[PDB]
Nucleic acid binder design. Sequence first.
DNA 1: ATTGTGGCCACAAT
DNA 2: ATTGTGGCCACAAT
DNA 3: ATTGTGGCCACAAT
DNA 4: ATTGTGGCCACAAT
Lengths: 404, 404
Amino acid sequence: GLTYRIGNGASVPISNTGELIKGLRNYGPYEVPSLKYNQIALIHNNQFSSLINQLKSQISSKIDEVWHIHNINISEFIYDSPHFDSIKSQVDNAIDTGVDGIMLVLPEYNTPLYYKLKSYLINSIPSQFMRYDILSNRNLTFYVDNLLVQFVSKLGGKPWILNVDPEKGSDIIIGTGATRIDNVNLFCFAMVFKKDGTMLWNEISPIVTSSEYLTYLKSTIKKVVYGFKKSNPDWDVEKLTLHVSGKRPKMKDGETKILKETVEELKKQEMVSRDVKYAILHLNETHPFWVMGPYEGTKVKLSSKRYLLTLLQPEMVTPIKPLSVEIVSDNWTSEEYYHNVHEILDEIYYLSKMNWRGFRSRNLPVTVNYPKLVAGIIANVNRYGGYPINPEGNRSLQTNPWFL
Amino acid sequence: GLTYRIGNGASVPISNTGELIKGLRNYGPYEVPSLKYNQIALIHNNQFSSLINQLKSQISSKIDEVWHIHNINISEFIYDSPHFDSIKSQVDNAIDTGVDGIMLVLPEYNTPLYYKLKSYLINSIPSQFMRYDILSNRNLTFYVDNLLVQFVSKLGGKPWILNVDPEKGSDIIIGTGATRIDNVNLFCFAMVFKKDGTMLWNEISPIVTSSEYLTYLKSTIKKVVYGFKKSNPDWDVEKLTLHVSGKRPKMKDGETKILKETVEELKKQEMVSRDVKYAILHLNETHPFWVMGPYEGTKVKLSSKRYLLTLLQPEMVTPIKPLSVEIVSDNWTSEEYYHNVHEILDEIYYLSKMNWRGFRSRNLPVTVNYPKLVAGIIANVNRYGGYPINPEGNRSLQTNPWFL
DNA sequence: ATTGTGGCCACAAT
DNA sequence: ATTGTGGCCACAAT
DNA sequence: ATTGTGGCCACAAT
DNA sequence: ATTGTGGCCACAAT
Ligand SMILES: [Cl-]
Ligand SMILES: [Cl-]
Ligand SMILES: [K+]
Ligand SMILES: [K+]
Ligand SMILES: [K+]
Ligand SMILES: [K+]
Ligand SMILES: [K+]
Ligand SMILES: [K+]
Ligand SMILES: [Mg+2]
Ligand SMILES: [Mg+2]
Ligand SMILES: [Mg+2]
Ligand SMILES: [Mg+2]
Ligand SMILES: [Mg+2]
Ligand SMILES: [Mg+2]
């Protein structure tokens, strides 16, 4: 069935990390990132460490041979103390020398230091953190293998995409919703994807109170569609799907009404086709269950509007991590309705196979999973007082997966 | 997998009515009923009717050739008016001539007449009603075929039993619970089954108010176990299962406590083994759902105590009629627990294939289905003021399936 | 912060 | 007394 | 009351 | 305007 497309027109089966890695070695990734400096900084507090040298050697050989990113050099910067100012001084030194990305090794668990540095780096340059105490207790081959999937993605590469039928499913899918920081505060998100799983544009609102949810939900979605349309001016959106998720205020009927108005306003503004066909879906992870005795791709109808996708967890007991899918609004005709239901459910299943955090599928649609990654950063940068992250006006933050 | 055992040691596959009927013709039913008079009365208001003659001819040939009940004669009794007294006069005339059962043809839908006559007959002799206006608009072959399954069962025959492994599952299963007549009144039931699906003994309480539920639940169960033990004095019950069902008062923790006490008291009275292993299960029909794309026998674990059986309903859309199964109490050890879970769930699935109302399986466990049939009669005999039905003291009502 | 899952066991909840 | 949760830790993944 | 399921369509609910 | 329910009726089952 489903396969991943990598470089040189090649495709590999899903659910098979060994063949995916061998495929990258033979054919390269779907897109090799183009870089300005062809230079990466490795920033650490372990000068002359054997492990650092082994780590550097695996990184340099896999970037060249697996990712096909040629002529890269790694420069080292040593910080003298595990504190914000000392590390930041080396980050700034690396940026001053001219680098495309920073790999930053921290000595231990340190939530405030990590989120202060991470928010600074996300606002500056693609970056990848590492924990020396963890790295020193891992199979280094598996560690670096998965590390590079997400670092190459942060550099703007595309490791692999979904091989999907171009005539089925949505022109774009917008993952949208809000995530709660606490009982009162939240932020809205809206992330535009192609049906092949690649993210085109992402927007998040400022942190606001629950009372401001519906205003900022509409404005955040409008902003992401504007950004998508400016960066993809020749994209005609004739089939549009919203995936709504996140722990957010319980205003279901009011929320659906606002989301419908938003699509209608975007139609009037000619940001999507005047004849766009669209559906607004709620995607909810529900309680896991176990088949005690082929649910890969299975679709369950609970009512005309309510469905369940039996996603496998990533005693002949088969673990299922089901996904609730509710159609809360659509402009489909009765004659096309069930055809479209099948297509949107298949689409959600294909999107569940897209994950650039590592080689192994998360078995969770990227339209739900990537906002969760974003929420983890925004919440903790707020909690530990780092540098605010707002992608507006910042093309790198609007188009690259800095949340991986 | 599962098969039905019929006469002469033969067995036929489940889910295949054509082979079940051919099997009865070749080998007979599992048990042919022994009768006193070898005489059935056909009571109707259509003397010299061609249809009545066709009906009589099919009945007489199928009783002999399909059911292997030999030397039966059918006598006719004509009532002159479709009213209780006129029909009852012919019922009494038939009983006076000496008959094993009565087949009674009514002209049309008539709920008060039907339940007054039915309650009289259930208190007198095995009986089978028919509607002339329906019979005159049916394939007579299919009509009589299924008619005789339940009439032979009412005469004490055993059409077929489940072929189950004698070393797996319960020694007896007690279907118990209560059914509401209305918001205030209810009656309790308790029905003892073998694991092959055959009913050994059944008891129902008088109609009482909800305030008296737990008292009569305990007494009704005790009464059915006493009756079972007197009629099966050599039965050792070392493995016991309760299937609790019915719309009844929401007293879940109080009900479970009473059911546990009841088993313990029966242990102390040596009505079951002192070392009996038992479980008390709640069986609930839940909302149907449809697989849009092998659930025959599939078991789903929701928690250590909560399960779902995906029973098939009796667009490649597969209809499921799931059955919730909750273990509310058991004395199993941790080492035997999941082995026993599998056995009780398989058992419930096998019991879902037992139905003597007709040839086609109801796909609902007989421990739930037969109490529902009983509830329909008791409620309506109360509502339309027929003759109360209380099986206590009446061996025919305690041991035969008069509710089919 | 490469990421995960799963066993253990103290403890909370009832 | 029984059931469920959470926090460390071991270790798997190709 | 052999029993079922499924289509239709009026109507209730919102 | 849309969604779901219920009551007749056609008809299937081997
Ligand atoms: Cl349906
Ligand atoms: Cl489990
Ligand atoms: K370049
Ligand atoms: K440089
Ligand atoms: K759902
Ligand atoms: K006899
Ligand atoms: K006689
Ligand atoms: K259950
Ligand atoms: Mg608002
Ligand atoms: Mg369709
Ligand atoms: Mg990451
Ligand atoms: Mg009581
Ligand atoms: Mg076991
Ligand atoms: Mg009947």
